Design a protein around this ligand. Structure first.
Ligand SMILES: Cc1c(C(=O)NCc2ccc(F)cc2)cnn1[C@H]1CCS(=O)(=O)C1
Length: 149
């Protein structure tokens, strides 16, 4: 899979994270990210995708060792952690044909797993609009505990 890069943007209180909502297959909420171009450095891809999806430029804020990286179905996704962005920042996508909306979410209210369907004795997981964000939530909470406490 082609690797993806993007960001976890947090506000000044460290309570809230910025998610984006796409269209079609990408209808759920997720962290801003996208696929790396040929010869593009990870930091440059993260900044480009985030600026395309949110209109906010992270380039001056990225720290090289501060990221969460997950390999899901043999595709690597790396999100740089960007704290301290004011909640009153005006975010606006460049790609308004791919982004429906952009919102802050309380980290403590976000799920870190989807719910099963054990009440219905049925296998699998119930739909959840945060499906794509979910795998990052526990690692993020653990990362914020180690870094800040
Ligand atoms: C890959 C994905 C996203 C996602 O990328 N996050 C938000 C986002 C939206 C636009 C954008 F330009 C960049 C990020 C969201 N949903 N999905 C689908 C995977 C298969 S599914 O389970 O049907 C849901």
């Amino acid at each position: 899979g082609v690797p993806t890069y993007g960001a976890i943007i947090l506000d000044e209180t460290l309570e809230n994270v910025l998610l984006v909502q796409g269209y079609l297959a990408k209808s759920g909420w997720g962290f801003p990210k996208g696929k790396v171009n040929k010869e593009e450095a990870p930091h440059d891809c993260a900044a480009r995708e985030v600026f395309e999806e949110t209109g906010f430029d992270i380039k001056d804020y990225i720290c090289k060792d501060d990221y969460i990286e997950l390999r899901i179905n043999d595709q690597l996704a790396r999100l740089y952690i960007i704290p301290g962005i004011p909640k009153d920042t005006k975010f606006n996508p460049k790609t308004r044909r791919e982004i429906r909306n952009i919102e802050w979410f309380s980290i403590e209210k976000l799920p870190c797993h989807r719910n099963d369907m054990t009440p219905k004795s049925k296998l699998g997981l119930a739909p959840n609009k945060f499906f794509m964000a979910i795998p990052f939530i526990r690692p993020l909470r653990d990362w914020l505990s180690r870094r800040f406490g």
